[PDB]
Each structure stands twice: as structure tokens, then as C-alpha cells.
Design a protein around this ligand. Structure first.
Ligand code: SF4
Ligand SMILES: [Zn+2]
Lengths: 115, 677
């Protein structure tokens, strides 16, 4: 049995636990906003996270291979839990202010390189 | 000789042991000591069996209690006979180097047609009727009526085996299938029955994959033989495909016509229990509803049984009784023969499958036919979608299941394609005094235009000219045998048509003979027969076939045969019929398998399997080419087996046709010099 961190009711199996090892029942699964899933490239661009940080830093971050809602052109996109990505980014960069400074200096360097 | 592994001594018939063999023995000993499953990959078709058998015998001698039964399931009968003769040679070597016999028994298992002595059933070519005729000749009722000694023609091998062959065992002396047949005919016994009696008191036994993957026969052939046993599936690169096909059935007009024809005869025999007499009468009309319905596809694995309880309102419980009905209702009816009765049997199996197994399956109906799509053909096929179902029973019944073949490059996809717990992750690359293979990937042609076999560029005139141009100079540099594989027959027939239309195919004809493999088995056999003699002399020949064909793996290109293997584009399975996409969707949300990766894995597996058949033996050598720029990408190169990766230098990955010819000329020129063993 797994105790949910939101409601406290014990549950055996849940989607969040099965797919991301998150101790949260499907009743408390706030997949709309709190548990929103984002693509790997979007997370890497927003949080400046590398592949190794998403695959080799303990604990490893799981993902769901879901076909894109658009055409069958090339879907099968990987989706990660937003909370886990945010936690990993905070651990790697220390604080959100550090991440903001990093992205600001990255865009400044991009402008410098283009000029 | 006596190889000294860290805790054992193993006798080997060959004095010289390659480092690959020693490393393989080390890995196998580690896996056996780990008491777990594993996966192996070796590039040698020959020399693996002798080492495997030697280490198995050494482990049995060292630990008789740990290992008791060994299974060496293979793909075909030639593999069975060659492993049997290799085991016989190993036993002779052990006898001559030791001096005393051991109580080891080794027998080979096959079908009833393969192991039979009656001359009245051998000439016929009905594999589905030999078992029925054998059952009719001898069965429980035959044994019961033999007490009165009724005067009627019937098999008598069992009538003597049950009184003579059930007492004397065979503690020593490994017997081949022909040896078993000879013993049966000299003792008046059936080889199949004596094998069934002697499997319990035996050391090793070999048979095909179908005796373990098929649940209807695996339990009968292996129920309580040994809880702790070692099983190995040599040359099982396509284990997932056969596992899927094990629970795959098809229905057509012929099957339903045969069933409706034979139900009248069944009723006539019956009128000469009642819970099933009327049960099957209305089952045929339910599936004939889709016959009158003109629809593209219907998918409802859970609702198929739910919809069955609507038109006729039948409970799901009686469906499970169909499997046990076969041994109860049929034997009392005394069916004369299985002729005109096989389609009826699979319907009961089909009913049991849908009733019980519906978690990872999907029902697909497709009214499409080759060149006559829409005339009349509602085809119902209960295609399987998960390969774990055919492999679950053997994993929990065994301790050291080992999967090995010549092409197992991705070791991370097999543990997730089917539920598996590998602890080995072992790959081996053969080495000799010289590089026996020269793999290379040809990108753009002499006109600096890519020759990729893209779907949108199949009809392009520029690419098809280069394919003929590539084969032109290639036919004049590598002699006595070139094997070319195409993506499909439809692409194959259009390829030669363009070459024939231009004045290019005739140039190839004067250099080498062009032989085309067709779907007909008889026409393929004679084409292969003339190909073998054409390469035997200096005339030379070209073998054109398809990567996903029965000839790709049905034959082995030994040295001096097929010195060059050509892959015209990456062989991708057709996405039509709405069967592969169903498997892709299932693996998408269950095993998190990338759709592109699985197609790439399937494409490279078949491509690497067929191209790897040109190297059989240490002295054998061959040329390997790839006529597609898509192979040059890293995502597909990594899908090649490790024994080919190191020989695929990065210098030749996008070289043109002219550059590829120069590499081939240099390689073949220096590979003909004498060497040392
Ligand atoms: S019992 Fe054996 S010998 Fe007799 S028909 Fe059957 S397979 Fe042949
Ligand atoms: Zn909760």
C-alpha cells in the first residue's frame, strides 16, 4: 500500500505511481495544472537541463512515450512530470534565480554570437 | 583438450581454442553460477554448439543435482541433425580420451511424419493428416479392441512397444532420429512412442521451437520433466516473430465452407453431449455476420465476447469448455480422420483464446486481397500483440533460459519487448588472422545523388539507374555468387522492369546469370539448384530475392557461394493491413517503445540477419554492402551486431559506387592469399 501525499488515503496502484513513482492516487492526480506533462525538448529549453541530468542523476526521471495529438507524421513524444523536472532543475542549479540568470546570460551570449 | 575454467575442467575435442570461445565459456559458467536467465550473441554458426555441449557436460558432471535436463531447441531439422552429430562426435571424443562410458542419453524429436515407419503414410505430403491417420490406426479405442484381436488393418508398433518397450530403458548410447527409426523398426516399435517413453530417462534432448512456444503442445511434451533445467534457443534472432505467430490464427472463405460442409457429417454421425451438440450450430452464423457487413476494420477485443452475448445471448463460461471438449466429445464420436475436420478444431481454440486472452490482443478484419481486393474476402485474423504471453510459461518453469543467435545487436530492447531479466549483456566478436568481412555503406551514386529506397522515390528514374549501375561494376569484381535482397516483391518486379526497359540489364547478363526468386517454392528450388551449379563453375550468377522471404533464412551461403551480399535499401515492413500499427500502439503505451525505433529495429534485424549468412566458418570470407544512405546514420549503424561494427570503418560510410568498387577490388585481391590455421 502507498499513502497519498495529498489526501492521505492508502492506495495500491495508481497511474502516477506506475509511470513516475509518484506517491499520489488517481483521485488527487491533478494532471491539468499540478501534474502537467511537457515534452523533453520544452523542458530542456526552459530549465536548461541536459540529457544526462535527466537520465543519469539519481534518481532517474521516467517518461511516457505518447503519440502526438497531431498527425502520425512523427509523434511518439516523450512526456515528463512537470514537478519532477522542476525539482531536478532546482537541485542542479541550486535556486530559481540562478536558473533565470543562466538563461539571461545564455540569450546574451546568443546575441553576442549572432552579432 | 582439458580447458581449466576457474572451478572446473572441461574436455574439448579441438586442441586449439579461440579467445572468443574461452570468453563465451567464461560467460556461460558465470551465468550458470548466477542461477538466472541471460542473452548471448556469437557470430559463428559452427563451433558454438561444440563448446555449448562441452560446457553443459562439464557442468552436469560437476553438479549433477544443479542441472538435470537440457533443451537445445532450434529452428529447423538440419540444425537438429547437425547438433546431434556434433554431440555424437563429442561423445566419441570423450570415450576415446577417457575409456569408460557414461549414462547419458540423447534423442531428437520431430513430427509424426518425420518419425514414422509405415510405408502407407510416408509418400503423402499432408502434414495435417498424418497425425490424424496415426491416431486412427492406434489410440485408446484401438488398444481396447486389440484384446479381442479384431481382424482389421492397423498400426502394430505400439501394440508391441507397450508390452516390450516399456520395460527396457536406454541408459547409454545417444541415438539420432534415423537411429531411433532403425531401432523402432528392428524392435517393431514406434519411434515417437519410444521417444515419449524415454524422455523421462534421458540426459539431453533436441527439438524445434514450436514444441515450447505453442501452449497446446508444450504442456504435453514438458509438464514435470525437470523443475530446474537449462534451455537454450540457438539462432533465435526472430524469437518475437515466432512467439507472435504462435497465437496467430486466420479465417477465410475456405475455412467456413469446410466447417459448414463437415457439420452435416458430424450431425449425421451424432444421430447414429447435448450441451455442445447445439452449441456449435449457431457459432458459424455469428462470424458470418461480418461476411455480409462491408466495413474496413472493427477493433473490440473486450467487446467481441460482449457482442457474442447479444445476437445469440450465450454466456462466456461455456467457451472455456471447448478446449476440454476435444478429448471428451470427439473420442467418443470416433472420428475416422482429421480430414475435413481441422478448421472445426481451430474454432474451439479461437473461442478459448478470445474468452481467456484479451488483455494484450486485438481482433482485426481486413477485406483486402492481392490484385483482387474487393470481390469477396472478409478475413478474420486473431493477431497477437504481446510477445510475453508465449514466453511467460517457460520463464517460470526454468531457471537459466538463454537466448542466442547471430544477430542480437540491441540487448536493451529484448528485455522490454518481452518480460525478461537479463544479467549478462554479453557480446562476442570473432577474430581471425585476417578480416573475413568488409562491410561498407554506399550513399550517393556516381552522379552525387542519394540511392535511398525511400517510398516517395521508388518510382524515381535517377535512383533506379544507380541501382543497376551499382550492380553492373559490382558483378565484374566479385565472382561466383552475388546475393541481392530487396524490400518487397512489388519493388523487386518494378526494379527489374526499369532495368530491362533501359539498355543496362543486358550488360549484367553477359557477366553473371540473373536469377529471380519467386513466391512459388518449387520454382524457387530449381532456381536455387541452377544457382548452386552456376557458382560452382566460372560462369557466375546473381541471386535476386527479398529480405523478408523464406529464402533469406532457409539457406546458408557457405564460402565460394554468395561472396557478396547487397542490400538495396533498408528493408521496412509494409505498414498496411493495419497489423503492425496495432502492435506499435500496444508497445507505445505498455512498454514505452518508440514507434520509429521498433521499425528501425525490425528493419535492421532482418537486414543484418540475411547479410550475416555469408560468413560460415573461419576460412570463409565475403563482402557486405548497403545500397542506402539511411544505413550511414548512427541510429541504424548501432543496430548492427558488434562483430560487424568494428569492421565498419568510418572512412567508408558515404562513399560512391566507384569508390565502393575500388574497396571491393582491394579487399578481394588480398583475401585470396594463403594463410595459416
Ligand atoms: S504409431 Fe508410429 S509407426 Fe504407427 S503410424 Fe503412428 S507414427 Fe507411424
Ligand atoms: Zn490522494
Amino acid at each position: 500500500y502507498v499513502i497519498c501525499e495529498e489526501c492521505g488515503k492508502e492506495f495500491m496502484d495508481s497511474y502516477l505511481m506506475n509511470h513516475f513513482d509518484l506517491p499520489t492516487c488517481d483521485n488527487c492526480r491533478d494532471a491539468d495544472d499540478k501534474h502537467k506533462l511537457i515534452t523533453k525538448t520544452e523542458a530542456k529549453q526552459e530549465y536548461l537541463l541536459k540529457d544526462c541530468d535527466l537520465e543519469k542523476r539519481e534518481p532517474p526521471l521516467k517518461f511516457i512515450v505518447k503519440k502526438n495529438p497531431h498527425h502520425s507524421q512523427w509523434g511518439d513524444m516523450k512526456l515528463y512530470l512537470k514537478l519532477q523536472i522542476v525539482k531536478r532543475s532546482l537541485e542542479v542549479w541550486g535556486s530559481q534565480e540562478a536558473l533565470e540568470e543562466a538563461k539571461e546570460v545564455r540569450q546574451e551570449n546568443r546575441e553576442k554570437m549572432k552579432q | 583438450m582439458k580447458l581449466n575454467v576457474d572451478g572446473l575442467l572441461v574436455y574439448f575435442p579441438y586442441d586449439y581454442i579461440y579467445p572468443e570461445q574461452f570468453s563465451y565459456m567464461r560467460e556461460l559458467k558465470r551465468t550458470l553460477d548466477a542461477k538466472g536467465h541471460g542473452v548471448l550473441e556469437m557470430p559463428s554458426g559452427t563451433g558454438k554448439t561444440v563448446s555449448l555441449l562441452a560446457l553443459i557436460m562439464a557442468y552436469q558432471r560437476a553438479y549433477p543435482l544443479e542441472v538435470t535436463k537440457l533443451i537445445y531447441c532450434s529452428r529447423t531439422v538440419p540444425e537438429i541433425e547437425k547438433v546431434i552429430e556434433e554431440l555424437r562426435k563429442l561423445l566419441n571424443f570423450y570415450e576415446k580420451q577417457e575409456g569408460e562410458k557414461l549414462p547419458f542419453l540423447g534423442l531428437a524429436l520431430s513430427s509424426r511424419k518425420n518419425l514414422c515407419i509405415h510405408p502407407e503414410v510416408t509418400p503423402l505430403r499432408f502434414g495435417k493428416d498424418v497425425d490424424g491417420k496415426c491416431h486412427s490406426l492406434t489410440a485408446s479405442y484401438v488398444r481396447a479392441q486389440y484384446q479381442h484381436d479384431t481382424s482389421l488393418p492397423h498400426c502394430r508398433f505400439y501394440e508391441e512397444f507397450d508390452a516390450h518397450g516399456r520395460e527396457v530403458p536406454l541408459p547409454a548410447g545417444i541415438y539420432n532420429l534415423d537411429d531411433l527409426k532403425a531401432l523402432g523398426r528392428r524392435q517393431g516399435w514406434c519411434p515417437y512412442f519410444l521417444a515419449r517413453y524415454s524422455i523421462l530417462h534421458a540426459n539431453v534432448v533436441v527439438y524445434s521451437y514450436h514444441y515450447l512456444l505453442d501452449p497446446k503442445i508444450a504442456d504435453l511434451v514438458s509438464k514435470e520433466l525437470a523443475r530446474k533445467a537449462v534451455v537454450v534457443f540457438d539462432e533465435a534472432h526472430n524469437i518475437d516473430n515466432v512467439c507472435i505467430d504462435s497465437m496467430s490464427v486466420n479465417l477465410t472463405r475456405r475455412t467456413l465452407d469446410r466447417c459448414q460442409g463437415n457439420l452435416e457429417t458430424l450431425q449425421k454421425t451424432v444421430l447414429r453431449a447435448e450441451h455442445f451438440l447445439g452449441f456449435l450450430r449457431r457459432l458459424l452464423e455469428y462470424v458470418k455476420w461480418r461476411l455480409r457487413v462491408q466495413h474496413v476494420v472493427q477493433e473490440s477485443p473486450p467487446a467481441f465476447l460482449s457482442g457474442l452475448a447479444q445476437r445469440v445471448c450465450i454466456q462466456r463460461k461455456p467457451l472455456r469448455f471447448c478446449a476440454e471438449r476435444l478429448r471428451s466429445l470427439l473420442h467418443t464420436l470416433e472420428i475416422t480422420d482429421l480430414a475435413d475436420f481441422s478448421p472445426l478444431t481451430l474454432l474451439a481454440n479461437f473461442a478459448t483464446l478470445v474468452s481467456t486472452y484479451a488483455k494484450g490482443f486485438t481482433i482485426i478484419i481486413e477485406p483486402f486481397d492481392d490484385r483482387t481486393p474487393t470481390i469477396a474476402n472478409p478475413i478474420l485474423h486473431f493477431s497477437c500483440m504481446d510477445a510475453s504471453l508465449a514466453i511467460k510459461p517457460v520463464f517460470e518453469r526454468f531457471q537459466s533460459v538463454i537466448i542466442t543467435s547471430g544477430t542480437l545487436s540491441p540487448l536493451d530492447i529484448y528485455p522490454k519487448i518481452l518480460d525478461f531479466h537479463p544479467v549478462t549483456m554479453a557480446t562476442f566478436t570473432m577474430t581471425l588472422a585476417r578480416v573475413c568481412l568488409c562491410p561498407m555503406i554506399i550513399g550517393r551514386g556516381n552522379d552525387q545523388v542519394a540511392i535511398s529506397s525511400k517510398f516517395e522515390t521508388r518510382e524515381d528514374i535517377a535512383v533506379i539507374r544507380n541501382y543497376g549501375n551499382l550492380l553492373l561494376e559490382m558483378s565484374a569484381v566479385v565472382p561466383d555468387g552475388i546475393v541481392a535482397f530487396f524490400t518487397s516483391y512489388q519493388y523487386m518486379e518494378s526494379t527489374v522492369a526499369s532495368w530491362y526497359e533501359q539498355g543496362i540489364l543486358e550488360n549484367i547478363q553477359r557477366n553473371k546469370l540473373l536469377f529471380i526468386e519467386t513466391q512459388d517454392g518449387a520454382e524457387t528450388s530449381v532456381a536455387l539448384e541452377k544457382y548452386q551449379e552456376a557458382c560452382e563453375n566460372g560462369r557466375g550468377a546473381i541471386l535476386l530475392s527479398v529480405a523478408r522471404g523464406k529464402v533469406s533464412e532457409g539457406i546458408d551461403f557457405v564460402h565460394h557461394y554468395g561472396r557478396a551480399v547487397i542490400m538495396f535499401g533498408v528493408p521496412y515492413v509494409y505498414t498496411q493491413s493495419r497489423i503492425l500499427k496495432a502492435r506499435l500502439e500496444y508497445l507505445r503505451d505498455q512498454f514505452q517503445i518508440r514507434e520509429n525505433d521498433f521499425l528501425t529495429f525490425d528493419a535492421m534485424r532482418h537486414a543484418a540477419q540475411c547479410v550475416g549468412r555469408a560468413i560460415r566458418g573461419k576460412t570463409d570470407y565475403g563482402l557486405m554492402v548497403f545500397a542506402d544512405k539511411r544505413f550511414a546514420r548512427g541510429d541504424k549503424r548501432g543496430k548492427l551486431p558488434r562483430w560487424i561494427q568494428e569492421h565498419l570503418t568510418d572512412a567508408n560510410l558515404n562513399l560512391t559506387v566507384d569508390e565502393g568498387v575500388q574497396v571491393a577490388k582491394y579487399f578481394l585481391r588480398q583475401m585470396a592469399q594463403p594463410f595459416h590455421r
